[PDB]
């Protein structure tokens, strides 16, 4: 327990006094020495390179002492554990030696000759010794999976070194055998096998096809979206039986991934290309056999507004016809896909699903298609696509609020619970991690009549659909948005808080990210759970202000917004977006900080404190509200900095007014992209402004937001691997690229209007992982931000000014006083906080980010 809780030197103090009473009787000295080895490894984990060896040669001197002539001689359990321990010690020494330039030979010659038993030659010998010891261990529930996983990750990290042998033949089988019983760590490490297969198509293919059949089926649902997209391309024979039997056993965790993968499909003209076509046809035929999932998706499609759908269509055509002058036989097929459920006034029939508004849309916009069908369908010339925006204006002028009745979708409204029909099985379940029980999963037995529309620049609708469990499950249907990235970041947060719940430092504080289920049934149509009793942070700040204060904030051009705009346009001379380009060089640190402080001194300081004290009615529960708010916000801030998540404006943050916890949404920039592909880069690692500092104003910010961030960062960086492997899987996913990045950017407006072609090479889906590993293994956040600016804002005339303002001044801004790498957790988080609260950075950020509040 002491070793588990990181409370070191207490296990040492007790083991020193327990050493004598361990060799008098057998079957105890082996356990004593193995615990000593585990303690030494754990202590060496959190130490420097020079001291890492000095604390592991001592144990190996003691571990080799008290030799095999004991209970260890033959019970093939102590032997296996000891082999694992020797392998771990040797690999630790090898990693410590190799990480440095091998200039660690400043220790006394005694240790030099002690480690010289078996330059690069000794390193290779140590690696070989570790490999042999691990092989000996694996040659022999719990206690056996450990050796399998140890050898597997050893081989994986050895192979990863070559990216910048017989290991692939080993690791695949050695980890599939472990996963066969139960292994969540290998479950999260599964797509590394896919990367191995892509790297070594000539080996282990038949090995997997023979081995993957033995594994239980339900351990694959958590990664089914990778396999379904995999079988589209080559190497589909690697795993095809598992998909077939999983769509046989559980034909509900496959339908949506299959639909999204089959929306964009590919094949080959060879025998292999001709192969798997019958397979995918058979899978699609055995699925949707009742034709009810497609009916549900079509019914939900009518719920989405048509105005923003046509806006997305206009963006798509104005991008394709412009950037692809030689595009052929694409505009007509997209024209019919758009006609499928939106175009014709005579939709009744195949179109169907009367809405009284889409049919009203089939009453004014209908047959306004001369321009359209009569010309672009025949000559197919681009002509001018900007002569269609007044059409959108015309349909927007009649943007009546729908949803007064559910009769806007007849299938939705009269969805009686019909008898045996291959029932719907409401999306969101099938999370993996255990035996699924589809008989216990809830199913929808009726949709609520009342439907309300939110306000998020897309106007998503809220449905209050019921369930067969006699419960009411609210949901928020999102139309026209690809939710695959949201699913990926939610899985990332799941593994993140799983890591967070595996250390006494963070588990004692009950540190846990709050996640909401996200499930996209198809492209441009997904469901995100609508959490109950939550208030957006911006609304919580606004509504708690006095009426006069709110009026003076939204008007009276002395308020921070208009004053900031006037300051920018006066310092730069431009009244348009992008004036920051010349505004950055237009001021020094002193003028910027003085102006920022003057502008920030307008909004009330204790607005958050007033909001928290206005819904407590007790000095005894207000403290327990503020504490929870601060703790959760700090945790999500450090977690967001671990990834590249940016664009943390007020509307994204939601605070659960019931209990004070904070949640984040709208992960539109999964990895570092808020500081690269924008007119104005976001230089703050996270959000920490005056309303967060003054929430505990009589008590400096280094009190509660500091220890929480330190503990979370230590928990993340002390156990790399699972998190790093998951991020590497996500970045290399082929649905995450600049084919949908620009799509979701044009889904919004104003920020990063997409007109570029050379930058498509500037995506670099290989440096994101390098930067994440650097900032996770210890790196100055200023250095990381400067590197991101260098990558994304190359040959920019203001790039030098950007790096200068993101670096520091050596008189303040502690974030530039430390080595560029090898930082400790406390110093790293201090640099994070200083960058977040630097007035210079906040004073020259995007206006919409609202830096003042």
Swiss-Prot record:
The chain holds residues 3245 to 4128 of 4128 of the full protein. It is linked to Immunodeficiency 26 with or without neurologic abnormalities: A form of severe combined immunodeficiency characterized by reduced or absent T and B cells, recurrent candidiasis, and lower respiratory tract infections. Some patients show dysmorphic features, severe growth failure, microcephaly, seizures, and impaired neurological functions. This is DNA-dependent protein kinase catalytic subunit. Residues 664-689 are annotated as: Activation loop. Residues 821-853 form the FATC domain. Belongs to the PI3/PI4-kinase family. The modification Phosphoserine is found at residues 456, 546, 751. DNA-PK is a heterotrimer of PRKDC and the Ku dimer (composed of XRCC6/Ku70 and XRCC5/Ku86). Formation of this complex may be promoted by interaction with ILF3. Component of the core long-range non-homologous end joining (NHEJ) complex (also named DNA-PK complex) composed of PRKDC, LIG4, XRCC4, XRCC6/Ku70, XRCC5/Ku86 and NHEJ1/XLF. Additional component of the NHEJ complex includes PAXX. Following autophosphorylation, PRKDC dissociates from DNA. Interacts with DNA-PKcs-interacting protein (KIP) with the region upstream the kinase domain. It comes from the Eukaryota. Serine/threonine-protein kinase that acts as a molecular sensor for DNA damage. Involved in DNA non-homologous end joining (NHEJ) required for double-strand break (DSB) repair and V(D)J recombination. Must be bound to DNA to express its catalytic properties. Promotes processing of hairpin DNA structures in V(D)J recombination by activation of the hairpin endonuclease artemis (DCLRE1C). Recruited by XRCC5 and XRCC6 to DNA ends and is required to (1) protect and align broken ends of DNA, thereby preventing their degradation, (2) and sequester the DSB for repair by NHEJ. It comes from Homo sapiens (Human). It is found in: Nucleus; Nucleus, Nucleolus; Cytoplasm, Cytosol. The modification N6-acetyllysine is found at residues 16, 346, 363, 367. Residues 644-652 are annotated as: Catalytic loop.
């Amino acid at each position: 327990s002491a070793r588990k809780q990181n409370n070191f030197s207490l296990a040492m103090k007790l083991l020193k006094e327990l050493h004598k009473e361990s060799k008098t009787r057998d079957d105890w000295l082996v356990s004593w020495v193995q615990s000593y080895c585990r303690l030494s490894h754990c202590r060496s984990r959190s130490q420097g390179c020079s001291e890492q060896v000095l604390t592991v040669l001592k144990t190996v001197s003691l571990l080799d002492e008290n030799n095999v002539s004991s209970y260890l001689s033959k019970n093939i359990l102590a032997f296996r554990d000891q082999n694992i321990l020797l392998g771990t010690t040797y690999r630790i020494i090898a990693n410590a030696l190799s990480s440095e330039p091998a200039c660690l030979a400043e220790i006394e010659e005694d240790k030099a000759r002690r480690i010289l038993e078996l330059s690069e030659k000794v390193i290779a010998g140590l690696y070989q010794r570790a490999f042999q010891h691990l092989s000996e261990a694996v040659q022999a529930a719990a206690g056996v999976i450990d050796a399998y996983m140890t050898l597997a990750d050893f081989c994986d990290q050895q192979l990863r070194k070559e990216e910048e042998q017989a290991y692939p033949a080993l690791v695949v089988e050695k980890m599939l055998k472990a996963l066969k019983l139960n292994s969540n760590e290998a479950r999260l490490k599964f797509p590394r096998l896919l990367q191995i297969i892509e790297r070594y198509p000539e080996e282990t293919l038949s090995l997997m096809t023979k081995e993957i059949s033995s594994v239980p089926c339900w351990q694959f649902i958590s990664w089914i979206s990778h396999m379904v997209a995999l079988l589209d391309k080559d190497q589909a024979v690697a795993v095809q039986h598992s998909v077939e039997e999983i769509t046989d056993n559980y034909p509900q965790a496959i339908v949506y991934p299959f639909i999204i993968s089959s929306e964009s499909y590919s094949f080959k003209d060879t025998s292999t290309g001709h192969k798997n076509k019958e397979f995918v046809a058979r899978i699609k035929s055995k699925l949707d056999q009742g034709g009810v999932i497609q009916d549900f998706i079509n019914a939900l499609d009518q719920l989405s507004n048509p105005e923003l759908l046509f806006k997305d269509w206009s963006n798509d055509v104005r991008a394709e016809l412009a950037k692809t002058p030689v595009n052929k036989k694409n505009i007509e097929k997209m024209y019919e896909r758009m006609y499928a459920a939106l175009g014709d006034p005579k939709a009744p029939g195949l179109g169907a699903f009367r809405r009284k508004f889409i049919q009203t849309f089939g009453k004014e916009f209908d047959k306004h298609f001369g321009k359209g069908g009569s010309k672009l369908l025949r000559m197919k010339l681009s002509d001018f696509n900007d002569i269609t925006n007044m059409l959108l204006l015309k349909m927007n002028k009649d943007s009546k609020p729908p949803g007064n009745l559910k009769e806007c979708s007849p299938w939705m409204s009269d969805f009686k619970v019909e008898f045996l029909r291959n029932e719907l099985e409401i999306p969101g379940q099938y999370d993996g991690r255990g035996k699924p029980l589809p008989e216990y999963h809830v199913r929808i037995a009726g949709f609520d009549e009342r439907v309300t529309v939110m306000a998020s620049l897309r106007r998503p609708k809220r449905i209050i659909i019921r369930g067969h469990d006699e419960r009411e499950h609210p949901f928020l249907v999102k139309g026209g948005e690809d939710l695959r990235q949201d699913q990926r970041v939610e899985q990332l947060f799941q593994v993140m808080n799983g890591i967070l719940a595996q250390d006494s430092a963070c588990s004692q504080r009950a540190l846990q990210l709050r996640t909401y289920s996200v499930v996209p049934m198809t492209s441009r149509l997904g469901l995100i759970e609508w959490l109950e009793n939550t208030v957006t942070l911006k609304d919580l700040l606004l509504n708690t202000m006095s009426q006069e204060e709110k009026a003076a904030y939204l008007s009276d051009p002395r308020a921070p917004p208009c004053e900031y705009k006037d300051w920018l346009t006066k310092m730069s001379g431009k009244h348009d977006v992008g004036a920051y380009m010349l505004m950055y060089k237009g001021a020094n640190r002193t003028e910027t900080v003085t102006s920022f402080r003057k502008r920030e001194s307008k909004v009330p300081a204790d607005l958050l404190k007033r909001a928290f004290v206005r819904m407590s009615t007790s000095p005894e529960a207000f403290l327990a509200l503020r504490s929870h708010f601060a703790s959760s916000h700090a945790l999500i801030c450090i977690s967001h900095w671990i990834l590249g998540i940016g664009d943390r404006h007020l509307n994204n943050f939601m605070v659960a007014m019931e209990t004070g916890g904070v949640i984040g949404i709208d992960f539109g920039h999964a990895f570092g992209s808020a500081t690269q592909f924008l007119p104005v880069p976001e230089l703050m690692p996270f959000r920490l402004t005056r309303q967060f500092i003054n929430l505990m104003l009589p008590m400096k910010e280094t009190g509660l937001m500091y220890s929480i961030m330190v503990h979370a960062l230590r928990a993340f960086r002390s156990d790399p691997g699972l998190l790093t492997n998951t991020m590497d899987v996500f970045v290399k996913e082929p649905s995450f690229d600049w084919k949908n990045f620009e799509q979701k950017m044009l889904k919004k407006g104003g920020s990063w209007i997409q007109e570029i072609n050379v930058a498509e090479k500037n995506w670099y889906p290989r440096q994101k992982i390098c930067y994440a590993k650097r900032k996770l293994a210890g790196a100055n956040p200023a250095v990381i931000t400067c590197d991101e600016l260098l990558l994304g804002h190359e040959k920019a005339p203001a790039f030098r000014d950007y790096v200068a303002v993101a670096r520091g001044s050596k008189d303040h801004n502690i974030r530039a006083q430390e080595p560029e790498s090898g930082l400790s957790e406390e110093t790293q988080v201090k640099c994070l906080m200083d960058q977040a609260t630097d007035p210079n950075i906040l004073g020259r950020t995007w206006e919409g980010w609202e830096p003042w509040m």
